[PDB]
């Protein structure tokens, strides 16, 4: 198992015409495997859909991924940011 | 032969039914040495819930239901021996005592550290006690070396910065610094240790050309001169 | 962080890790601990801060 | 890294110090020649640091 593998290529011919959105060198960079797509960082320990207790087939559409995320209400935000200034 | 904890192992393993302990004079019975009242809050608790309503089905090859729902009348008594005894505290506080600040600071400061058990300071050789010293550094070790390495943080800071659903927050790793910190110093710890030896060794080896009033003092000038005299030549 | 830090003898946790990450990874050569800290901290420093 | 664990029967950290305040000074030398020689110089000194 080696570690100084290359995994970042560059093609010779510069096609920078359409590419200002990309990942560039600075060309562009080919990696050798594709991206990975992370949803959310911090996840909600609690919150009894993965708690999953041991007391009493059902279903529920929760409101997106936010849920599990771990945010702060408005108002101590603007508590907060009249706590900015 | 830790009955509260093999009903765990059938409950994580999901097969508490297939087997169910064998509950009988040998088997319940060895473990136990009535059921010996668990201490948990509801880890050991739920358990007792899911093992009876598991037992509700053969209900007669296992006798120490028994055992367990006599325990479930005293865990009802003596919540209900509280929950008297919870509202006849709350009449029986005077209506003026005044509970002193500084006091409950150093009762809300001694109570925290106590709690995670630390050395608490009033204001109200020897190997013996060597490996009383490192049995409890050992225990710091063993206790850091089992945290999982995906551990983040959440200030109260980070709503002013507005962090999108993809950010990369630059307080996450706020514990995981000093988390990592704490346990390789305390393995680097008789390597500060060779080097105090060596720095202890050096500085005080000589302390009679440095140190001045030592140097300076009657006995060590006379001796410093008496191993510099050279020998007589005879003739 | 690669931006060079504060005034000297605070030592931060970035500074107090790479530290100790250099001597669990060389056990000597305080030239190859103080550039690891960064190379804003001195030899003779970071031997005052170990001990 | 090559550092031991701190739970070593090495943990003691003081054990062959000897300070130069402890150190052995050379003391006058007492001499004894015979039993019936009372006019010998009874001892010798010399580069003692006491009388």
């Known amino acids: 198992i080696m570690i100084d593998a290359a995994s970042s290529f560059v093609l010779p011919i510069s096609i920078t015409k359409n590419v200002d959105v990309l990942q560039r060198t600075d060309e562009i960079l080919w990696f050798r495997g594709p991206s990975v797509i992370v949803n ?31 945010r702060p209400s408005a108002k101590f935000t603007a508590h907060r940011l009249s706590m900015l200034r | ?19 169910a302990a064998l509950a009988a004079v040998a088997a319940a019975s060895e473990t136990n040495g009535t059921i010996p009242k668990p201490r948990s809050s509801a880890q050991l608790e739920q358990l007792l819930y899911r093992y009876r309503a598991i037992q509700n089905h053969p209900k007669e090859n296992k006798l120490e239901i028994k055992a367990i729902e006599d325990t479930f009348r005293n865990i009802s008594r003596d919540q209900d021996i509280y929950e008297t005894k919870l509202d006849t505290l709350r009449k029986s506080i005077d209506k003026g005592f005044q509970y002193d600040e500084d ?34 550094i050992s225990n710091r070790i063993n206790e850091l070396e089992r945290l999982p390495a995906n551990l983040g943080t959440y200030s109260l800071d980070d709503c002013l910065e507005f962090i999108t659903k993809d950010d990369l927050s630059s307080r996450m790793d706020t514990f995981k610094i000093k988390a990592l910190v704490e346990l390789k110093s305390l393995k680097l710890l008789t390597k500060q240790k060779s080097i105090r030896q060596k720095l202890i060794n050096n500085v005080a080896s000589q302390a ?11 006995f060590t000038a006379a001796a410093q001169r008496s191993v510099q005299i050279r020998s007589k030549v005879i003739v | 962080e690669n931006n060079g830090n504060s005034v000297k003898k605070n030592w931060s946790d970035q500074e107090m890790l790479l530290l100790l990450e250099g001597i669990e990874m060389y056990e000597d050569q305080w030239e190859k601990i103080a550039d690891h800290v960064g190379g804003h901290k001195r030899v003779e420093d970071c031997i005052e801060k170990f001990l | 890294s090559n550092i031991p664990d701190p739970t070593l029967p090495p943990t003691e950290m003081m054990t062959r110090f000897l300070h130069p305040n402890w150190y052995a000074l050379p003391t006058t030398v007492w001499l004894k020649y015979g039993n019936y020689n009372s006019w010998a110089p009874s001892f010798n000194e010399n580069g003692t640091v006491v009388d």
């Open chain 2, 208 to 218: 009679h050309h440095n140190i001045p009033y030592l140097r300076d003092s009657p």
């Open chain 2, 1 to 19: 032969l830790q009955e509260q904890s093999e009903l765990m192992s059938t409950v994580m393993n999901n097969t508490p039914t297939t087997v």
């Open chain 1, 40 to 70: 959310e960082r911090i996840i909600n320990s609690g919150d009894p859909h993965l708690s999953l207790p041991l007391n009493r087939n059902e279903k529920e559409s929760l409101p997106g991924p936010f849920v599990l995320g771990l």
């Open chain 2, 103 to 136: 006091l409950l600071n150093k009762h809300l400061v001694a109570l925290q550290l106590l709690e995670k058990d630390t050395d608490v300071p009033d204001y109200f050789g020897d190997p013996d006690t060597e490996i009383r010293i490192s049995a409890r």
